[PDB]
Design a protein around this ligand. Structure first.
Ligand SMILES: OC[C@H]1O[C@@H](O)[C@H](O)[C@@H](O)[C@@H]1O
Ligand SMILES: OC[C@H]1O[C@H](O)[C@H](O)[C@@H](O)[C@@H]1O
Ligand SMILES: NS(=O)(=O)c1ccc(O)cc1
Ligand SMILES: NS(=O)(=O)c1ccc(O)cc1
Ligand SMILES: NS(=O)(=O)c1ccc(O)cc1
Ligand SMILES: [Hg+2]
Ligand SMILES: [Zn+2]
Length: 257
């Protein structure tokens, strides 16, 4: 199975997922000097007031907080997007050390972690059909740096001891994802892919410029999770990030002058 070890990590994925060498792979380095302000971008609308979180799952490569996506509640509209994209799950990627962990980089700088809020385009009816489309998904990416604690992350941190190993889940109702956002919605956007197998080229990426701050204690609890299942040799869930991929024939647009 694919993973993040020496023997099954990002450099191996292309053997079972040849799109790994494709024309619009993610993540990428965001060269802030080359990114261009785009006046055609409409205002971005993150509308999470009616979000319904359900469950948190250790899937063996990260943990996902899952949402009710059976109707428009938590949605993402505007910016580069045509129509309405519904929140289905969020998850993070993080490092073994604070100096790495993000997937996107900013002028080559790696953050300690990166949050991905995953949305699917409602015109395609559900997530599975959306990932057959070049505009099926929108992922809102948010960098994490280590400093002050993020109060809106603490409920997540505290449940991780109940989902230590692959295949474990827990109830995670009444969680407000608005508590994970920075103040500013300034962003960069480009067309890309899922960053994990199957690496499908279906994503409009919207990467916020302002990081959130989380405490060292918060990210240390991410690093106590396990890639393995219960009863198997313990392999800490760390360094579950894909490195930056070639930009190829793409431009990164900025929402801000
Ligand atoms: O031909 C000029 C155009 O080139 C494109 O590559 C840029 O994205 C546009 O912003 C620019 O107006
Ligand atoms: O909001 C997410 C979760 O936060 C805390 O763990 C609460 O104790 C739990 O009831 C809730 O489901
Ligand atoms: N191409 S892959 O990363 O999914 C992979 C790599 C090694 C392996 O033994 C099985 C799968
Ligand atoms: N009652 S509370 O929302 O302040 C709370 C609950 C659980 C938790 O791990 C952190 C905070
Ligand atoms: N890491 S990611 O946000 O690009 C992502 C989102 C959904 C998914 O099924 C696989 C990967
Ligand atoms: Hg997995
Ligand atoms: Zn991700």
């Amino acid at each position: 199975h694919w993973g993040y070890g020496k023997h099954n990590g990002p450099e191996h994925w292309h053997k079972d997922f040849p799109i790994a060498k494709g024309e619009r792979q993610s993540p990428v380095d965001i060269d802030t000097h080359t990114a261009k302000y785009d006046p055609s971008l409409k205002p971005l609308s993150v509308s999470y007031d009616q979000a319904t979180s359900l469950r948190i799952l250790n899937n063996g490569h990260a943990f996902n907080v899952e949402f009710d996506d059976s109707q428009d509640k938590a949605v993402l509209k505007g910016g580069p997007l045509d129509g309405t994209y519904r929140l289905i799950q969020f998850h993070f990627h993080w490092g073994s050390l604070d100096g790495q962990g993000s997937e996107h980089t900013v002028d080559k700088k790696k953050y300690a972690a990166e949050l991905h809020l995953v949305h699917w385009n409602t015109k395609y009816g559900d997530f599975g059909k959306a990932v057959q489309q070049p505009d099926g998904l929108a992922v809102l990416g948010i960098f994490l740096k280590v400093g002050s604690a993020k109060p809106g992350l603490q409920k997540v941190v505290d449940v991780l001891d109940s989902i230590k190993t692959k295949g474990k889940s827990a109830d995670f109702t009444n969680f407000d994802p608005r508590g994970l956002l920075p103040e500013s919605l300034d962003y960069w956007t480009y067309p890309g892919s899922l960053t994990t197998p199957p690496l499908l080229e279906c994503v409009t990426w919207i990467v916020l410029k302002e990081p959130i701050s989380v405490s060292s204690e918060q990210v240390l609890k991410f690093r106590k999770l396990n890639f393995n299942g219960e009863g198997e040799p313990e392999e800490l869930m760390v360094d579950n990030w894909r490195p930056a991929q070639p930009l190829k024939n793409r431009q990164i647009k900025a929402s801000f002058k």
